[PDB]
Amino acid sequence: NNLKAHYQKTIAKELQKSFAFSSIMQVPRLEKIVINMGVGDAIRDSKFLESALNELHLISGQKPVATKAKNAISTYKLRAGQLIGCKVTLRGERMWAFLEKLIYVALPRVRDFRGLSLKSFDGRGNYTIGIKEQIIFPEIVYDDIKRIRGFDVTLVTSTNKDSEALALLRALNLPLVKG
Amino acid sequence: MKTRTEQRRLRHKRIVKKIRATNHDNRVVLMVIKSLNHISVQAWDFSQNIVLASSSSLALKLKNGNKDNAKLVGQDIADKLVKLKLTNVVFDTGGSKYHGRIAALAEAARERGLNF
Amino acid sequence: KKDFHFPSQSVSFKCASCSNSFTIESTLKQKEITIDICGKCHPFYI
Amino acid sequence: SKKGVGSTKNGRDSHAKRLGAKKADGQMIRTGQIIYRQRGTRVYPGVNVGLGSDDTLFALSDGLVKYQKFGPKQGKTRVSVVKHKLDA
Amino acid sequence: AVKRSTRLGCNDCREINYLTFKNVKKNPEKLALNKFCSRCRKVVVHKEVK
Amino acid sequence: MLQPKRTKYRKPHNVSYEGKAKGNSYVAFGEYGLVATKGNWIDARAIESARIAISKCLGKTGKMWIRIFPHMSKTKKPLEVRMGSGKGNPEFWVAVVKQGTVMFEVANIPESQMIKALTRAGHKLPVTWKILKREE
RNA sequence: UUUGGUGCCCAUGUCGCUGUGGAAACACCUGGUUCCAUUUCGAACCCAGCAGUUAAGCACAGUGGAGCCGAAUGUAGCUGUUUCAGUGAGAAUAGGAAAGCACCAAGC
RNA sequence: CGGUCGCCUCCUAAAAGGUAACGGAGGCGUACAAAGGUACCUUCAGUACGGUUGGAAAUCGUAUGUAGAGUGUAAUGGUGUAAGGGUGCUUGACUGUGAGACAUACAGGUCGAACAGGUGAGAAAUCAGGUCAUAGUGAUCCGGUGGUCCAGUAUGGAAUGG
RNA sequence: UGGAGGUAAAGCUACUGAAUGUAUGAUGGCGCCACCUAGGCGUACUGAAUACAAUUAAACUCUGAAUGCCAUUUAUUUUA
Numbered sequence: 011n012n013l014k015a016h017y018q019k020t021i022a023k024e025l026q027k028s029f030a031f032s033s034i035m036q037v038p039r040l041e042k043i044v045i046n047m048g049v050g051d052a053i054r055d056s057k058f059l060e061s062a063l064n065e066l067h068l069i070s071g072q073k074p075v076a077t078k079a080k081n082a083i084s085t086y087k088l089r090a091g092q093l094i095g096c097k098v099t100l101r102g103e104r105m106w107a108f109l110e111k112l113i114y115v116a117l118p119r120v121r122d123f124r125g126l127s128l129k130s131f132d133g134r135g136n137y138t139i140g141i142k143e144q145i146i147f148p149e150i151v152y153d154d155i156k157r158i159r160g161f162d163v164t165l166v167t168s169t170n171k172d173s174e175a176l177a178l179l180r181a182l183n184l185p186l187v188k189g
Numbered sequence: 190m191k192t193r194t195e196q197r198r199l200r201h202k203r204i205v206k207k208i209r210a211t212n213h214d215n216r217v218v219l220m221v222i223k224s225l226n227h228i229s230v231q232a233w234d235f236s237q238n239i240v241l242a243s244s245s246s247l248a249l250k251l252k253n254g255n256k257d258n259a260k261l262v263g264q265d266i267a268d269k270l271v272k273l274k275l276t277n278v279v280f281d282t283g284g285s286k287y288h289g290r291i292a293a294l295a296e297a298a299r300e301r302g303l304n305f
Numbered sequence: 306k307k308d309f310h311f312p313s314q315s316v317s318f319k320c321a322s323c324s325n326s327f328t329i330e331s332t333l334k335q336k337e338i339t340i341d342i343c344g345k346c347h348p349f350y351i
Numbered sequence: 352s353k354k355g356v357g358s359t360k361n362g363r364d365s366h367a368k369r370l371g372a373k374k375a376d377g378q379m380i381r382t383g384q385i386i387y388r389q390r391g392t393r394v395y396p397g398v399n400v401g402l403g404s405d406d407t408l409f410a411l412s413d414g415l416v417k418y419q420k421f422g423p424k425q426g427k428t429r430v431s432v433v434k435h436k437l438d439a
Numbered sequence: 440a441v442k443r444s445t446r447l448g449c450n451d452c453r454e455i456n457y458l459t460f461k462n463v464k465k466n467p468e469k470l471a472l473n474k475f476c477s478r479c480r481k482v483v484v485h486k487e488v489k
Numbered sequence: 490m491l492q493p494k495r496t497k498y499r500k501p502h503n504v505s506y507e508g509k510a511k512g513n514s515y516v517a518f519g520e521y522g523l524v525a526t527k528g529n530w531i532d533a534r535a536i537e538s539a540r541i542a543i544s545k546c547l548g549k550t551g552k553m554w555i556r557i558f559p560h561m562s563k564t565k566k567p568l569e570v571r572m573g574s575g576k577g578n579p580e581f582w583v584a585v586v587k588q589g590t591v592m593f594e595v596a597n598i599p600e601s602q603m604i605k606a607l608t609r610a611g612h613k614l615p616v617t618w619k620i621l622k623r624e625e
Numbered sequence: 626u627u628u629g630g631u632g633c634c635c636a637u638g639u640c641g642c643u644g645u646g647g648a649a650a651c652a653c654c655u656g657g658u659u660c661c662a663u664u665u666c667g668a669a670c671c672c673a674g675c676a677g678u679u680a681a682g683c684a685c686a687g688u689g690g691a692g693c694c695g696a697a698u699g700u701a702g703c704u705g706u707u708u709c710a711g712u713g714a715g716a717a718u719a720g721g722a723a724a725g726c727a728c729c730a731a732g733c
Numbered sequence: 734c735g736g737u738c739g740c741c742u743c744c745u746a747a748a749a750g751g752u753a754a755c756g757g758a759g760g761c762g763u764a765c766a767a768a769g770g771u772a773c774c775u776u777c778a779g780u781a782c783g784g785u786u787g788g789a790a791a792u793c794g795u796a797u798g799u800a801g802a803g804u805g806u807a808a809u810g811g812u813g814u815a816a817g818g819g820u821g822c823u824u825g826a827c828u829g830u831g832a833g834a835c836a837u838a839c840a841g842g843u844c845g846a847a848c849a850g851g852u853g854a855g856a857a858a859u860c861a862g863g864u865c866a867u868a869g870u871g872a873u874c875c876g877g878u879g880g881u882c883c884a885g886u887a888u889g890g891a892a893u894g895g
Numbered sequence: 896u897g898g899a900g901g902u903a904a905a906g907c908u909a910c911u912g913a914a915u916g917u918a919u920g921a922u923g924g925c926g927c928c929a930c931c932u933a934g935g936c937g938u939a940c941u942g943a944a945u946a947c948a949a950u951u952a953a954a955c956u957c958u959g960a961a962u963g964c965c966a967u968u969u970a971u972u973u974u975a
């Protein structure tokens with residue numbers, strides 16, 4: 011990606027100067043964006059889960075692996091050995107492609123993207139974005155599951171400090187309130 | 190969760206435990222350790238806990254990390270073992286999957302008079 | 306991994322007001338699909 | 352008057368398996384003789400000592416048996432058969 | 440007692456040479472293993488025999 | 490009546506009171522204490538009698554601690570029953586007091602009332618009691 | 626002697642904190658076109674190369690914080706004979722402790 | 734009269750083994766073609782933080798945590814790179830045996846090196862004669878079924894036996 | 896002299912239960928308000944978790960003997 015090379019040059023220079031980092035790779039580096047569109051309807055409407063996967067596939071270019079619960083609950087109708095939820099973890103070129111596509115196409119189409127930040131870092135440098143609806147994503151046709159759901163896009167970084175993660179986010183211009 | 194070297198050490202510990210449990214004929218144990226740059230090999234004896242023979246890319250002075258130089262390393266170590274009059278060996282990796290460079294070293298040693 | 310039926314092809318995206326033809330890999334029509342609200346067309350971002 | 356008496360409900364016990372050490376440390380032993388019968392490995396096997404389908408330790412060669420304490424805080428026991436090693 | 444045992448017989452000399460166990464309720468399909476045969480002195484397919 | 494809320498086993502073997510003193514040997518919460526000179530089984534009923542006695546002869550600001558607790562239960566076969574047919578049912582809870590265990594301690598009221606209070610507590614118990622003080 | 630690998634050991638070997646280091650090597654790293662691989666991801670495994678790198682890891686010095694180890698005296702239980710001679714714990718404590726023993730390859 | 738009658742696990746059982754009572758607690762008369770065999774890879778439960786449906790608790794990411802997780806089961810013992818989880822190929826859940834031992838009144842029970850035949854996994858070393866281990870079982874007689882290099886009451890068969 | 900063990904004792908921040916006091920305190924009961932649902936300020940009091948000090952156990956053990964047991968070495972004795 012041309013923006014990937016732009017990321018290289020720009021992130022290196024500003025970050026290096028911003029904290030006098032003694033090495034170019036001391037600057038934070040983003041690793042992997044997990045997407046987890048999971049639903050318990052597979053306990054009853056198994057069909058739905060299948061469609062779920064395809065949409066997830068259609069969004070990232072990686073086929074989603076379906077995850078299984080590690081316990082069993084009667085109230086939730088849960089039982090061990092069943093597949094409830096798919097997770098995809100993008101890396102390399104595809105992860106940066108999805109990140110740019112999200113921030114530039116999907117996110118500003120959000121009904122009311124006022125944003126949320128500073129109050130999202132887990133204290134170790136991660137970040138989770140809770141999407142409310144799937145239809146807003148461009149890689150989705152109107153025909154879909156009878157139920158509509160959101161997403162749990164998350165982020166990782168090489169650093170362990172949440173403040174430096176915020177600094178990388180600002181350098182990348184991820185558009186949130188004051189952050 | 191870890192770094193590559195720690196996982197390789199863990200797998201190597203598994204292999205060493207198995208070999209020390211089942212090696213009944215007290216064969217010499219040929220542990221080869223592959224790095225990002227080079228790959229070395231040493232023939233220990235778990236009964237005496239010493240090294241009988243050794244060979245390495247540093248010893249052979251090659252820009253290693255290639256399947257080509259693995260054949261040279263295997264030929265040298267097999268020649269040294271033959272000079273030592275030991276031919277019944279057990280071959281274990283440093284914890285890496287037996288393939289590529291590791292497979293070439295083992296086959297070069299086998300084709301030069303070794304019995305394993 | 307590879308050998309997929311859903312090919313990630315570099316599709317260009319146009320937008321209103323500001324053209325901003327962003328080229329991104331996706332499994333959609335291979336042409337300049339126009340988006341009505343892009344990043345630059347948002348009161349929050351600018 | 353007898354007043355009657357209640358009934359007991361637990362009077363069942365199983366046969367006692369004669370487990371424990373069979374060959375003591377320093378005793379000469381031939382191959383195939385039992386050294387330790389146990390339920391679950393209470394004594395680990397060492398050199399020249401095998402295992403069975405009942406976690407029973409038996410010898411694999413002639414020699415003197417020998418116990419050595421090992422493991423974290425010296426809480427694990429290990430048995431071995433040090434061969435005759437007469438070696439002239 | 441319950442009877443979960445089953446007999447496995449050769450398919451060359453039609454001799455029964457093995458005694459095994461099988462759950463008719465769980466496993467519905469007949470066993471078609473390959474075991475050693477004393478008569479043929481080789482490995483050969485042994486099938487379930489009534 | 491002090492009684493354990495639950496027990497794993499209803500009918501345990503009785504616990505001997507013969508021997509020296511394992512724990513609860515020295516006054517460590519108050520500063521005057523009632524030591525025993527004869528190991529015996531004393532039940533929760535005697536504790537309540539002694540505790541009520543101390544509280545009635547206490548004042549408005551005195552404070553007390555009960556060290557021993559009736560952990561172990563004891564059974565009793567019903568009357569007119571011949572030997573056999575299993576162990577009896579648990580009847581009463583007893584605390585095991587060995588020779589040298591401090592049962593009750595008192596503090597925060599003058600010495601004479603405390604000496605008198607420990608005396609009335611010990612007259613309610615079968616063991617031969619003795620007064621002891623806390624080391625400085 | 627130092628670095629790297631490995632076996633023996635199984636915290637007086639740990640967890641953590643503060644600094645220093647790279648010549649060769651160890652490592653991150655550069656790419657997935659080849660062999661090979663993902664219950665999906667060249668993340669890992671596997672390739673072929675060392676551009677950048679001392680954040681890591683790794684190696685050294687300090688750090689008694691957590692964890693671990695723990696003397697002598699005395700005591701409880703034991704064996705006898707005494708109503709005293711040995712045997713001697715657990716707990717607690719002063720305190721130690723920033724691993725140790727061998728083999729191999731390189732400049733030494 | 735009530736209760737029990739066989740086998741397995743713990744305590745009583747007094748730190749080898751063994752040890753009774755109408756002493757104190759429980760289980761078993763199985764399950765698995767994979768929960769067996771092999772090669773490779775991999776490692777808790779819980780909790781903290783951050784996140785649509787989703788809620789105290791479904792799933793995700795990071796960290797912490799030295800077993801409170803799992804090991805089909807009643808307990809005990811064992812086991813956190815294991816004996817737990819996943820994948821590929823398979824059927825050793827083989828044939829004929831078996832030196833030497835454990836424990837035993839007998840009958841029976843338990844472990845097993847090693848040999849020959851032909852296989853499975855694996856590059857090979859090696860492993861596989863059912864499962865992490867201990868309960869899941871009933872003698873003799875009688876008759877029935879399959880195979881068979883034995884007998885066939887003068888001889889050839891058959892009947893009837895072995 | 897070597898070894899196996901987990902009893903006596905002791906300990907419960909080394910687990911499983913039982914369990915005392917002090918301090919910080921989840922929690923509820925109890926109120927008084929506002930609000931019909933999100934709640935708030937004190938609680939005669941109940942009491943999670945943590946820290947300090949102290950306890951109990953055949954079926955509790957981070958520990959832990961002596962005696963006894965097995966084998967071997969030396970001396971002596973008996974043909975069992």
Ligand SMILES: [Mg+2]
Pocket residue numbers: 365366367368
């Ligand atoms: Mg028993």
Ligand SMILES: [Mg+2]
Pocket residue numbers: 679
């Ligand atoms: Mg550094």
Ligand SMILES: [Mg+2]
Pocket residue numbers: none
């Ligand atoms: Mg009757």
Ligand SMILES: [Mg+2]
Pocket residue numbers: none
């Ligand atoms: Mg015993």
Ligand SMILES: [Mg+2]
Pocket residue numbers: none
């Ligand atoms: Mg005894």
Ligand SMILES: [Mg+2]
Pocket residue numbers: none
């Ligand atoms: Mg169990």
Ligand SMILES: [Mg+2]
Pocket residue numbers: none
């Ligand atoms: Mg398998």
Ligand SMILES: [Mg+2]
Pocket residue numbers: none
């Ligand atoms: Mg298994």
Ligand SMILES: [Mg+2]
Pocket residue numbers: 875
């Ligand atoms: Mg009859």
Ligand SMILES: [Mg+2]
Pocket residue numbers: none
């Ligand atoms: Mg005839």
Ligand SMILES: [Mg+2]
Pocket residue numbers: none
């Ligand atoms: Mg005791």
Ligand SMILES: [Mg+2]
Pocket residue numbers: 907
């Ligand atoms: Mg406790």
Ligand SMILES: [Zn+2]
Pocket residue numbers: 320321322323324325341342343344345346
């Ligand atoms: Zn625009």
Ligand SMILES: [Zn+2]
Pocket residue numbers: 449450451452453454476477478479483
């Ligand atoms: Zn046949």
